[PDB]
Design a protein around this ligand. Structure first.
Ligand SMILES: [Zn+2]
Lengths: 55, 69, 96, 120, 100, 68, 112
RNA sequence: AGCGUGUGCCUACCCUACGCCGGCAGGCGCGGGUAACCCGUUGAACCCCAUUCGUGAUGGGGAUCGGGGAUUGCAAUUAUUC
RNA sequence: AGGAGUGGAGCCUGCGGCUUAAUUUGACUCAACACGGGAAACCUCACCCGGCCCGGACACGGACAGGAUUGACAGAUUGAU
């Protein structure tokens, strides 16, 4: 069955369980504190969330 | 004389399953029959010991320069 | 795409009761979050709304991972003829 | 000609004992594969290939059943057979010796050909 | 009577202003009030690259948040806490009220 | 387009005409006589039949094979 | 997500910024735009549509929120609104230079 | 000693005190923490004190490699790791 | 003026070259070479040997509820019930 073979790889762990919430690319994720974002979109919305530059 | 079995260097031999602490001529004989066993069994490890390349899965492009001339 | 009758029409009164609905854009979604009483996936919902888009009844907007589908007045008329209702029932979008 | 054995016992002696003591005779890595739940999740292929190896011809060389799997636990129940496993391009036909056990069929089929070198 | 009121925000000036409002109301109602206990703040340090590609000098950023918390323990019944929570509401600082 | 490797065609189901002739036998009396064994599963109805093989029958979307 | 969603939606309305507030059972959001007659749609239709969208997409109890609408003063003192106005002037198709000195004159007469 | 970190929308991978088993990594229960509350007074390494070693490719250096035992995972062979 | 060094030894990583069904690609003095947040066993994958699903919407014209097709079981079959 194609319906039962469509889910044959378990997506429990690895890189494919998580993805970017903006650009949907599984490269350079930030799993810190539940961003689940890539670095570039985090840069684009860093000050909108509230991350500023002081140090 | 009450030495623990796990301390011995060779455990669970393929010919008898008996734990035995082996010595110089014994290690040389066991190494050469193991090499001959891998050559006769024709495995990936046997081909690597025949070719002299890496066995434990490591790179050769950068390190291991002094393999041959 | 061959849809069962019940799932498609259930999408139709969910669109008719409240004139706007959202859905996450992902192929591998075995169950819709809001409509979880019956086993309905999401890809049939996206394909049915894409068909409605191409025949010109709904609009599209996409921000991160969620599709936003916006009905029109002539879309409300199409829902009224497809659900076979008298022209007196108006959804809460036009109501105060 | 000499007597072959694995851990001091014979092939038929391995044949008439169950998996619960077969793992006790095996090594540490082979135990955790066989003792991890039920062989139904991904090892339904393993069970069906073991059924297919239990299917037998009359008295000749047994059939070749070429496979697409490399993580085969080489059991004594399939000693003396013919199989060619997949390594990406073709099927390397190998005859199953009694010393195959304790290894994998993917270990006995090389993927890369022997690399030769010439003028840079 | 053992109610603990926790005030937390990011901007310390608005939190100090609403703490001044709380202590002014407590002194107006003429009852004992605990001073605002100041915990050490928690920092949000994330260091990401500046080049989106792999070209150029390796330069980084320093993004940071400061969250300041000041809790007031009040020896009053619940309805005064509910009234003072209902008055003077701003989105900069949130109010955490939970009896033990 | 035409590639090097051959391709097996999809299962083009051949159209069979007058299938409603081949479900019940009609005689002079008005009582019908079914020619196929009925599926007793609750997923399908009482009007469905079983497949006509040469050894044993076969149900519909239930996909249940009953022996003798 | 709310700011990007309103930026994408009200690009053809002149949207400046969203004023989110938190309040017990009165969690209200204010959308500051230069146009008031176009944000409400037709007899308060699009504001209720956006209310329902955020209501059952963000995850909230139903009926406890309301979407306000107001106009921003000093239209020439907002960088987003003037960039959107120049995007209005450029989307129809004009010379870039006349629009550039026009929006510069608008900025200078606004008091910047 | 000090920066920190510690139970997730999709989601299932959190930090460990305490008492047994075992040289060892590790195995089952009794718990705490949505956090200056519990790990935690984070008994860190370097360093200090006392024997053994004695200029020797040597208790320096630990590459290469054989056997055995455990955890993660559907799967470790082209040694994942210990 | 000096301190620690690198370059020589072993190991890890990257690049070029050779090789490969494929060993995917960009970056070549500062201002590319533990860089692409690139510590990849499977997804990652963009590379290859191979096989199924359509995820070809919507219109125009052929076929209609008497059927336009998907869903499958003793057995040859890749690779898999
Ligand atoms: Zn049936």
């Amino acid at each position: 069955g194609h319906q039962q073979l469509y889910w044959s790889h378990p997506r429990k762990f690895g890189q494919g369980s998580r993805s970017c919430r903006v650009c949907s690319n599984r490269h350079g994720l930030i799993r810190k504190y539940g961003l689940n974002m890539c670095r570039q979109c985090f840069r684009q919305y860093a000050k909108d969330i509230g991350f500023i530059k002081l140090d | 004389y009450k030495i623990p079995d796990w301390f011995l260097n060779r455990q669970k031999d393929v010919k008898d399953g008996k734990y035995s602490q082996v010595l110089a001529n014994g290690l040389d004989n066991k190494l050469r029959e193991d090499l001959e066993r891998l050559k006769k069994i024709r495995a990936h490890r046997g081909l690597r010991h025949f070719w002299g390349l890496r066995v434990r899965g490591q790179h050769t492009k950068t390190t291991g320069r002094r393999g041959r001339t | 795409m061959l849809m069962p009758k019940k799932n498609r029409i259930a999408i139709y009164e969910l669109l008719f009761k409240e004139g706007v609905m959202v859905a996450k854009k992902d192929v591998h979604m075995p169950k819709h979050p809001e409509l979880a009483d019956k086993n309905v996936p999401n890809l049939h919902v996206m394909k049915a709304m894409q068909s409605l888009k191409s025949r010109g009844y709904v609009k599209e907007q996409f921000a991160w991972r969620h599709f936003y589908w916006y009905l029109t007045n002539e879309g409300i008329q199409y829902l009224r003829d497809y659900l076979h209702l008298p022209p007196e029932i108006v959804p809460a979008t036009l109501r105060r | 000609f000499r007597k072959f054995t694995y851990r001091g016992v014979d092939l038929d002696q391995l044949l008439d004992m169950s998996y619960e003591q077969l793992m006790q005779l095996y090594s540490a890595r082979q135990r955790r594969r066989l003792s991890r739940g039920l062989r139904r999740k991904q090892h339904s292929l393993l069970k069906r290939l073991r059924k297919a190896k239990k299917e037998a011809p009359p008295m000749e060389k047994p059939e070749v059943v070429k496979t697409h799997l490399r993580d085969m636990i080489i059991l004594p129940e399939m000693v003396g057979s013919m199989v060619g496993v997949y390594n990406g391009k073709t099927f390397n036909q190998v005859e199953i010796k009694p010393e195959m056990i304790g290894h994998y069929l993917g270990e006995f089929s090389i993927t890369y050909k022997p690399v030769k070198h010439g003028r840079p | 009577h053992r109610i603990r009121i926790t005030l937390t925000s990011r901007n310390v000036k608005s939190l100090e202003k609403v703490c001044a409002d709380l202590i002014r109301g407590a002194k107006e109602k003429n009852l004992k009030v605990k001073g605002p206990v100041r915990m050490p703040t928690k920092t949000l340090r994330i260091t990401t690259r500046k080049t989106p590609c792999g070209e150029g000098s390796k330069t980084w950023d320093r993004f940071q948040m400061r969250i300041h918390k000041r809790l007031i323990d009040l020896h009053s019944p619940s309805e005064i806490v509910k009234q003072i929570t209902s008055i003077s509401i701003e989105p900069g600082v949130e109010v955490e009220v939970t009896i033990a | 387009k035409s590639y090097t490797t051959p391709k097996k065609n999809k299962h083009k189901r051949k159209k069979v005409k007058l299938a409603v002739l081949k479900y019940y036998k009609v005689d002079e009396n008005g009582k019908i006589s079914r020619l196929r064994r009925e599926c007793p599963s609750d997923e399908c109805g009482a009007g469905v039949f079983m497949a006509s093989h040469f050894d044993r029958h076969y149900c519909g979307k239930c996909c249940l094979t009953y022996c003798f | 997500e709310l700011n990007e969603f309103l930026t994408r939606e009200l690009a053809e309305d002149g949207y400046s910024g969203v004023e989110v507030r938190v309040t017990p059972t009165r969690t209200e959001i204010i959308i500051l735009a230069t146009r008031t007659q176009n944000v409400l749609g037709e007899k308060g239709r699009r504001i209720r549509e956006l209310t329902a969208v955020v209501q059952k997409r963000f995850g909230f109890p139903e009926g406890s929120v309301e979407l306000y609408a107001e106009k921003v003063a000093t239209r020439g003192l907002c960088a987003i609104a003037q960039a959107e106005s120049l995007r209005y002037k450029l989307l129809g198709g004009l010379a870039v230079r006349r629009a550039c000195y026009g929006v510069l004159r608008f900025i200078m007469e606004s008091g910047a």
